[PDB]
């Protein structure tokens, strides 16, 4: 993004923020951090928000069955879990029918 004007950067930031609004609708701490982050006179807040995201994403890793500290690398583990749960659901359905 080094070679694009501030206007486009602002526009895409606005769009990202609009998306984030819906994304974090549910959460309250992340929502509050976002609600704080938009003051133009406190830029570090935005950075803080990002930290709060990763930090948050880590606690809800549910490390009982997942290990990757980086949430980006935990997508594979969640996919594994979905596949396993689909198999388990099939088994449970068969058991219940019988």
């Amino acid at each position: 993004l080094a070679y694009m004007e501030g206007g486009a950067l602002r526009s895409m930031s606005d769009k990202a923020l609009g998306a984030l609004r819906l994304a974090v609708a549910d959460n309250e701490h992340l929502r509050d951090a976002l609600r704080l982050s938009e003051d133009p006179k406190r830029p570090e807040r935005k950075v803080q928000f990002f930290i709060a995201v990763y930090q948050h994403l880590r606690e809800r890793i549910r490390q009982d069955i997942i290990r990757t500290d980086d949430p980006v690398d935990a997508i594979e583990q969640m996919e594994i879990e979905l596949a396993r749960l689909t198999e388990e659901l099939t088994a449970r359905e068969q058991k219940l029918a019988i």
């Binding site: 594979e76 996919e79 594994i80 596949a83 396993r84 198999e87 388990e88």
Partner: protein, 148 residues
């Protein structure tokens, strides 16, 4: 029947272990011609279903087995099977053990399927990449040049 007598009785009854007790054998006589959808060898026994008296056999117990004369000039020698058909109380425990076994099979299969998915995803990412990316791949850094 007990786990110990289950093998003995299973060997004693042989392919007839799974038979159905019908004291008449005449109810199936008319329907017999109709039976085209049935196990290749259906077994029926005659006696009281509630208190059936053990089928008379030309049995002869041997070490962990039972010889029997099924018909004139015909003997069937049933070795004591393990985890038999009769005694289907702990056999449910064995099919539970089968579930336990298949748990690991499912886990391994899930790992393999996930690996397949990851490889496919990586391949697709690389294909897309090259589609958009080859034109400037491994080309020189403009930044250093511009600084110079």
């Amino acid at each position: 029947i007990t786990i110990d007598d289950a093998p003995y009785f299973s060997a004693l009854y042989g392919p007839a272990r799974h038979g159905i007790v019908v004291p008449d054998l005449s109810l199936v006589r008319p329907h017999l011609e109709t039976l085209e959808d049935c196990p290749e060898d259906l077994y029926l026994i005659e006696g009281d279903p509630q208190s059936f008296d053990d089928s008379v056999f030309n049995a002869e117990e041997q070490t962990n087995a039972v010889l029997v004369k099924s018909s004139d000039r015909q003997w069937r020698y049933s070795r004591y099977p393990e985890l038999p058909l009769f005694g289907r109380a702990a056999r449910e425990n064995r099919l539970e053990a089968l579930n336990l076994e298949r748990d690991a099979l499912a886990e391994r299969y899930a790992t393999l399927s996930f690996d397949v998915q990851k490889i496919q995803r990586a391949h697709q990412a690389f294909s897309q990449f090259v589609g958009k990316h080859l034109s400037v791949a491994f080309d020189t850094d403009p930044e250093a040049e511009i600084r110079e």
